[PDB]
Design a binder for this molecule. Sequence first.
Ligand code: NI
Length: 341
Amino acid sequence: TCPFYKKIPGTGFTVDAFQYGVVEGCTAYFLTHFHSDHYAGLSKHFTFPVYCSEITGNLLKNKLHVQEQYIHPLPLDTECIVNGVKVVLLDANHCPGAVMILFYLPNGTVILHTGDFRADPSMERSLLADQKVHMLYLDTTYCSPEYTFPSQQEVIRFAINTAFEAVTLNPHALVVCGTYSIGKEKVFLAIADVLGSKVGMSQEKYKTLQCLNIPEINSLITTDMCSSLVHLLPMMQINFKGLQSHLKKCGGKYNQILAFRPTGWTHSNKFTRIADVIPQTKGNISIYGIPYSEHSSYLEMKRFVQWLKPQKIIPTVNVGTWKSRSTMEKYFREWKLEAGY
Ligand code: NI
């Protein structure tokens, strides 16, 4: 049975609600982005209308084989009518194709569902600027002050400089980057660009990347591992054993691996600056964990909400425990009292 925080009152609509069977009353199923916790339940046998971005629609069709007749892609930043209700899709600054959804209810209520997002001041000048929001369904993944991390730009700067240094010292080193889903493509694309290489990967991952409308992508990725000095591997293989095993397969072309694990937040963030990050090393293998996040830090979240000034907040993440729920509600009240809404 579908939880309340995935239902949109006054509509026949649900959000990211595909694992509950046929939802009683639902005339349209929205999908914010192509991550498995959110699409869980979709397959080629799904026969209800799915509304989403163009990029999400490319992945539904090519990776999950959803039939075309049930995929309804919408443009961003454009007022659209769905089953007689005005909606707008906005860029969520999450993974490729990720959106937030603005719903304009027949009774006059305006609701924003953020999906998964990394709040940014640029959002303060989208179509959000133009009217009031009554209810906010909020990605609260990192809703606690201990959650700090750097900008995406600082993290990429660290990775490019690290990789360029190592390979210039040793032209026989291989760089490997971990992946398990879409998102965080900048990590491997920025490193390959500084090294003048394409990124090599499996046929399944190449397929996924070809659905994402990235400009000039055919110039940047390949399935020919032998031609590439940046390789992508599943995140589970980014350990000393998995990497040793990969180095064996490269036929003596390389004698060193430098690997990156883009994580979300990790507690080494409470002490260390990005500049000071060091790898784990065993022999000719080094592994860097880098805090590249596609969710709001606590401060970015706070700033967005204090700017929007919603009448009610409904968290969508960390809702399973009473202590989490109580923690989040305390911060929401602080934010409201500090800003005066
Ligand atoms: Ni996500």
